[PDB]
Amino acid sequence: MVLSEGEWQLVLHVWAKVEADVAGHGQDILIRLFKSHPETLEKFDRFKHLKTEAEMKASEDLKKHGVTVLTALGAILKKKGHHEAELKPLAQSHATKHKAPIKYLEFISEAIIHVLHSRHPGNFGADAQGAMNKALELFRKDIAAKYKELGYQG
Numbered sequence: 001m002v003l004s005e006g007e008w009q010l011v012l013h014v015w016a017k018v019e020a021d022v023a024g025h026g027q028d029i030l031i032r033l034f035k036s037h038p039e040t041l042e043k044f045d046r047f048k049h050l051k052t053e054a055e056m057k058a059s060e061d062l063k064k065h066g067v068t069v070l071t072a073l074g075a076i077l078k079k080k081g082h083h084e085a086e087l088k089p090l091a092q093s094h095a096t097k098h099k100a101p102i103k104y105l106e107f108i109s110e111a112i113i114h115v116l117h118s119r120h121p122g123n124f125g126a127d128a129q130g131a132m133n134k135a136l137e138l139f140r141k142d143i144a145a146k147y148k149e150l151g152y153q154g
């Protein structure tokens with residue numbers, strides 16, 4: 001698929017606001033994922049012991065991982081579709097080591113959209129949400145194709 005320039009501008013305009021507080025957004029997104037879809041927590045040996053939202057919010061480790069996650073995603077989005085090199089090591093680790101199914105990438109996608117909608121209503125109207133959804137769908141499609149080349153699931 002291909003996004004237009006005007007779609008990429010909508011994506012990077014809201015992402016510029018996210019980047020004012022990467023750690024806070026990273027925490028909100030992972031906590032949303034883990035509360036919405038508790039099954040995903042089981043993939044993280046590092047975090048699986050966390051019982052409550054309160055425990056998640058107080059974890060320095062979870063916050064650090066949120067920063068890692070959003071920094072990797074932010075680098076991919078700023079490539080505006082030209083992200084083949086950034087995607088390769090990410091696909092390899094998530095297919096072979098972490099075993100992160102496409103369905104769980106859908107779930108974190110939903111979590112990202114929820115948090116941007118909650119925190120940035122003025123810059124995340126319907127057209128901006130549509131552009132962010134397309135960017136994330138593009139990401140998932142390209143990662144699924146690499147999963148296939150690497151010998152993991154769809």
Ligand code: HEM
Nearest residue numbers: 040043044046068069072073089090093098100104105108
């Ligand atoms: C926007 C989607 C995601 C991005 C950009 C992302 C990014 C990253 C990065 C950069 C790392 C560290 C380096 C590496 O191991 O590749 C990592 C590790 C990891 N990811 Fe993801 N990830 C995403 C989605 C997921 C999902 C949905 C799952 C599983 C439900 C997952 C499970 C893991 C695990 C288990 C680790 C290792 C954590 C640890 O023990 O240090 N990832 N991810």
